[PDB]
Nucleic acid binder design. Structure first.
Lengths: 380, 123, 147, 242, 255
RNA sequence: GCGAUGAUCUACCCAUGGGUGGGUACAAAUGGCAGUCUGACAAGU
């Protein structure tokens, strides 16, 4: 009385037509349990009749949600409709083997001529299927089942536990790592090219140590010679001639003592200067972007302290959760000076707590804390 | 439609048992009173259970904590008044979080275990 | 489609064929190809019936309506399925809506070149309207006036 | 110990776990995603060169993770091997799941289960970071209801504290566990029922298990770490039970 | 001659090492970011440059399933990428974040291109400054030699055995001060000649190549009248090539 | 017009000025450690 069974997988349903039945009175027996484990006979016990894949990960997700919740999905309805032989329900109704006693009623109300069985007998059939699996399908289904398992598992998890999007923080973490190391290696390359081009012209080096402006000045000056009063006014359109620096560099170039060098060195070093200039632009841009994300995700802690410093705390702690979680002395770990510092540590622990666990932050409440600490400092 | 971020919160009778047990506890020094006190007991693994209030402004200061409680398997409750909790825990300002600590050498032992089980049933 | 072909061109139990098509569609609401041949099959139905009544009468817009209803349901369903391919920000929402509308209306354009032809294209553009697409199909209206 | 000592790593008897010897000895397992301590635990580093690379071992605080308390109190066969799979009922975090996932390693996979939400959120974070886990965030009382995601888990670990612990494992294990597969329970007297006392509680739970066919291979108390706890290792037979 | 400046030679090569180092670290970091969006990638493809090129191509797994990846990646691997994009565990990223990561990727590509630009620059400069050595032993190795010894007069100032041993000075000095046996290769390992030699032959070829390198180095270095055509180096390479293949042909077994 | 949302508490001179000493993180360098292997035979018949 178990003619058909329904089995399902992450990527697609299947229906099997059982060709026999393992006997029923004695199905805790040593022998029949072994026969379920030993594929050499369970093949005789079941053969595949159909397999209906899924269309996309999204539809597989919504389908798995439904088969959890106990309602029949559209693909499920269609596959059963295409499979099951019909009957006049009053005499000799058909039988299907399912594991969800909860699902049973929905199937019955849809098809008034099908009986869902879930005994220990049918759970054993499905266990045999769950065990052997991919050998049974004869190959109809391509795909890294296991990969689909992990993916769908994550998706179903997130969907129900209600993960949020803005509350991401690793972006803040990696952002601050970038800004720090980026300032470091930008300065490295800045003094690199500074020494290198001072080989040709060290007067500019001793004049301006400012790096990005150094890069732009290198971008203008090709060699220490092709500089006129027109170039003087051009540097005036650039940084400053009122400071006299344009006159300084033109005089030092007229008297220039750095040995002039190969043309190809001028072009490639100009390429280098363009590189460092674009990189500095990039760092400033990313800094502003960090400001944006901080004021969006956690403006509370930031307004209490500052964008970059709040990112320092979040990174060094590990994440926004952990930083909010831990008590208000580790936040100090990460005379009047000590006193005001500890007070601020407690209040920033506060700000972090609210600013994480909420669904969105409150700059005004952050400002209230800021003003309270400010009035205490004034009390000092 | 969603349960509020304070659930659970007790009815008045259970409020009475909680606050009374808290008071005797504070008089017998089995009690770490204060939000950071509570978080640090939870960390140190010496907590019998956790009371806290659900009217402080804002609520999220202490809403952080039951995360630790659920992970570590210790029960937690929200009483409807930091003012009442303060007057019952015996200090000068409103209190929003307190933790009853473990020690079996406790002359209120059976009292606290019965009340803790009441809480577990609330959940 | 091959089973439909055998069943039809050797015997043409049109009820059997329509059942095959509707079942296959229910299983594969993603395949615009299959929607295409279902539409052209119902066209074959209509044309065969029209010619048979013609020859019978010689010896001795319901149809556009059904075709365009098929068109309508195909549009709605494929649009939904194409959204659900990669199923969240308002801006990407907007651009992907733009892209799926582009795809669906390209499929409509293929339906038109597939193509009572005047009435069919008329209702196609009606359901359409219910930018560059706008200008292309108003040019199409001009070409219809030519036709 | 401190932050400057150099330790000596050593392959523990159980595959996957590792003694770290020094002036003072520790239990340490591999780490999958290097460079991010999960919960404030120190991580030994080693370096091996072909040019160099850094690999990273992680201490397993037995006070804080129950299975690790058991390992350090000595079990005979911990069924969790560097290749197999696992089901892990009751992981309010990855606090033990991080380690079990690391031991199980890249080729095996490990399933986590939770009922709660917010612990589930943190579990999602960890599952994002690490591949081995797949997280199931459902009420653990309906293997029917998440049957979607599991095929022949090769062992089970039970951490839950619900007084129907034996029934809940019976259900999930029947549905999922491979035949002749290591069930491991972490029994808790008070969590099961307070008025009865520890030894009777352990007895009665082992009885329920021995009736639902999980032949209990051994028992352990893990005394010097936590009180009234226990770890009952059993082997799932289902055929030739007696 | 203004282009006869080993000072910028050494500056350029040191810059090459550094540029490689921070290229690698930025590759690792952008891997972290975009893998957080899409974590199958880093394990599927491994070239930082190619990875960045996919980043440039797409910004969402939909555009992954749509666009074509013919030039960057062969087709089996790219359909692997498409199926992963369909089913990936990682989350999805917002517009501004995508803009910023895309711009990082442009920066990575720019450092790449600039690096090989610099390498071929150094190639031309090197054949200009010391042609015979360049032809003999190899651009990169010769550049490193002149770098390590500082000035070209110094590098030619040194004798042959040194230029053989010049890299692994550490193990050399350890062996000397504890009476073990000396190392043999040092920096001239990566010379292509040794790169085809095999074992004890690599040692012997390292020795002979080192001596000829001393000759060529010196002649490029000091000669008042230079043809810049690498004649001595070229004939030297002929010589060592011959010595090699004859040594190789000598098989040690019995027949 | 105080506080559990946190009170109190974690080297030497010249009377809130200057000079000395130590302890961690970052950079510098042509400081140091710190010194550039041997020197006629080999291979084929």
């Amino acid at each position: 009385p178990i003619e058909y069974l329904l089995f399902e997988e992450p990527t697609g349903y299947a229906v099997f037509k059982v060709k026999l039945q393992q006997d029923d009175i004695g199905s805790r027996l040593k022998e029949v349990q072994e026969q379920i484990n030993d594929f050499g006979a369970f093949t005789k016990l079941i053969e595949l009749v159909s397999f209906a894949p899924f269309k996309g990960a999204a539809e597989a997700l919504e389908n798995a949600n439904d088969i959890s919740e106990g309602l029949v999905s559209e693909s499920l309805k269609a596959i059963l409709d295409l499979n099951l032989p019909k009957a006049s329900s009053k005499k000799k109704n058909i039988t299907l083997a399912i594991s969800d006693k909860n699902l049973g009623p929905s199937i019955k109300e849809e098809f008034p001529y099908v009986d869902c069985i879930s005994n220990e007998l049918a759970q054993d059939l499905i266990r045999g299927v769950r065990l052997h699996g991919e050998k049974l399908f004869k190959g109809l289904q391509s795909g890294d089942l296991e990969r689909a398992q992990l993916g769908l598992g994550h998706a179903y998890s997130r969907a129900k536990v209600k993960f949020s999007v803005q509350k991401n923080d690793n972006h803040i973490i990696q952002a601050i790592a970038l800004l720090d190391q980026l300032d470091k290696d930008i300065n490295t390359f800045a003094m690199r090219v500074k020494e290198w081009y001072g080989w040709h012209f060290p007067e500019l080096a001793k004049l301006v140590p400012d790096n990005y402006t150094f890069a732009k000045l290198v971008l203008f000056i090709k060699d220490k010679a092709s500089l006129n009063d027109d170039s003087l006014h051009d540097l005036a359109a650039l940084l400053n001639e009122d400071s006299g620096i344009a006159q300084r560099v033109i005089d030092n170039a007229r008297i220039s003592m750095g040995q002039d060098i190969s043309e190809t060195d001028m072009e490639n070093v100009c390429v280098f200067a363009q590189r460092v200039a674009s990189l500095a632009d990039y760092r400033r841009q990313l800094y502003d972007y960090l400001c944006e994300k901080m004021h969006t995700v956690a403006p509370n802690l930031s307004e209490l302290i500052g964008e970059v410093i709040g990112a320092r705390l979040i990174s060094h702690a590990g994440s926004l959760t952990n930083l909010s979680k831990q008590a208000a002395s580790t936040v100090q770990i990460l005379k009047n000076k000590g006193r005001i510092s500890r007070y601020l540590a407690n209040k920033c622990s506060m700000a972090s707590r609210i600013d994480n666990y909420s669904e969105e932050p409150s700059n005004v409440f952050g400002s209230v804390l800021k003003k309270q600490v400010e009035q205490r400092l004034e009390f000092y | 439609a969603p349960n509020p971020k304070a659930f659970p919160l007790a009815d008045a009778a259970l409020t009475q048992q909680i606050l009374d047990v808290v008071q005797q506890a504070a008089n017998l020094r089995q009690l770490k009173k204060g939000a950071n006190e509570a978080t640090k007991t939870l960390n140190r693994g010496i907590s019998e259970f956790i009371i806290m209030a659900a009217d402080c402004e804002p609520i999220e200061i202490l809403l952080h904590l039951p995360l630790l409680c659920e992970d570590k398997n210790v029960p937690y409750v929200f009483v409807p008044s930091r003012v009442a909790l303060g007057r019952a825990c015996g200090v000068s300002r409103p209190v929003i979080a307190a933790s009853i600590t473990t020690n079996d050498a406790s002359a209120i032992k059976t009292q606290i275990y019965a009340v803790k089980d009441k809480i577990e049933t609330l959940l | 489609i091959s089973c439909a072909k055998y069943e039809y061109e050797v015997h043409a139990n049109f009820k059997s064929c329509r059942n095959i098509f509707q079942n296959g569609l229910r299983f594969n609401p993603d395949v615009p190809k299959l929607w295409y041949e279902y539409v052209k099959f119902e066209l074959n139905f209509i044309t065969k019936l029209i010619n048979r009544r013609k020859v019978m009468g010689l010896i001795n817009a319901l149809r556009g309506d059904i075709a365009l209803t098929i068109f309508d349901v195909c549009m709605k369903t494929l649009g939904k399925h194409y959204i659900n391919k990669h199923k969240s920000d308002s801006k990407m929402n907007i651009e992907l809506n733009k892209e799926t509308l582009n795809y669906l209306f390209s499929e409509s354009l293929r339906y038109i070149k597939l193509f009572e032809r005047d009435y069919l294209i008329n209702h196609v553009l009606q359901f359409w309207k219910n930018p560059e697409l706008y200008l292309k199909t108003v040019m199409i209206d001009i070409t219809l006036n030519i036709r | 110990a401190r932050g400057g000592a150099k330790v000596v790593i050593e392959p523990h008897r159980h595959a996957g776990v590792y003694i770290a010897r020094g002036k003072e000895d520790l239990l340490v397992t591999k780490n999958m995603a290097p460079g991010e301590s999960v919960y404030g635990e120190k991580r030994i580093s080693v370096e091996e060169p072909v040019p160099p690379t850094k690999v990273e071992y992680r201490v397993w605080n037995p006070f804080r993770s129950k299975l690790a308390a058991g390992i350090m109190g000595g079990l005979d066969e911990l069924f969790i091997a560097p290749g197999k799979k696992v089901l892990y009922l009751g992981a309010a975090s990855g606090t033990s799941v991080s380690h079990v996932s690391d031991v199980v390693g890249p080729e095996g996979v490990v399933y986590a289960v939770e009922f709660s939400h917010r612990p589930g959120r943190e579990l999602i974070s960890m599952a994002k970071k690490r591949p081995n886990i797949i997280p199931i965030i459902e009420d653990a009382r309906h293997p029917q209801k998440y049957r979607m995601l599991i095929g022949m888990v090769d062992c089970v670990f039970a951490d839950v504290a619900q007084p129907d612990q034996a029934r809940i494992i019976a259900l999930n294990s029947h549905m999922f566990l491979k035949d002749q597969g290591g069930v491991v329970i972490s029994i808790k007297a008070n969590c099961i029922d307070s008025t009865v006392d520890a030894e009777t509680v352990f007895a009665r739970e082992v009885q329920k298990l021995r009736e639902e066919r999980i032949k209990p291979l051994e028992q352990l108390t893990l005394e010097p770490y936590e009180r009234d706890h226990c770890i009952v290792v059993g082997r799932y037979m289902r055929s030739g039970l007696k | 001659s203004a282009d006869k400046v080993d000072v910028m030679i050494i500056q350029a090569i040191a810059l090459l090492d550094d540029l490689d180092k921070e290229l690698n670290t930025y590759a690792m970091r952008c891997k972290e970011w975009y893998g957080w969006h899409f974590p199958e990638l880093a394990k599927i493809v491994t070239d930082s440059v190619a990875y960045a090129r996919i980043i440039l191509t797409m910004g969402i797994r939909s555009k992954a399933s749509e666009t074509d990846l013919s030039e960057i990646l062969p087709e089996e691997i790219e359909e692997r990428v498409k199926t992963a994009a369909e089913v990936s565990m990682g989350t999805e990223i917002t517009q501004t974040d995508l803009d910023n990561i895309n711009a990082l990727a442009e920066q990575i590509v720019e450092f790449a291109a600039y690096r090989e630009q610099l390498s071929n620059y150094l190639s031309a400069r090197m054949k200009a400054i010391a042609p015979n050595l360049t032809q003999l032993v190899g651009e990169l190795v010769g550049a490193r030699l002149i770098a390590h010894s500082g000035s070209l007069i110094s590098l030619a100032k040194s004798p042959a055995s040194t230029i053989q041993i010049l890299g692994a000075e550490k193990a050399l000095f350890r062996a000397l001060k504890t009476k073990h046996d000396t190392p043999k290769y040092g920096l001239l390992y990566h010379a292509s000649l040794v790169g085809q030699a095999t074992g004890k032959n690599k040692g012997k070829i390292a020795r002979v190549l080192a001596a000829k390198a001393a000759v060529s180095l010196r002649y490029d270095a000091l000669a008042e009248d230079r043809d810049d055509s690498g004649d001595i180096g070229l004939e030297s390479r002929a010589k060592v090539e011959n010595r090699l293949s004859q040594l190789e042909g000598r098989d040690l077994r019995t027949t």
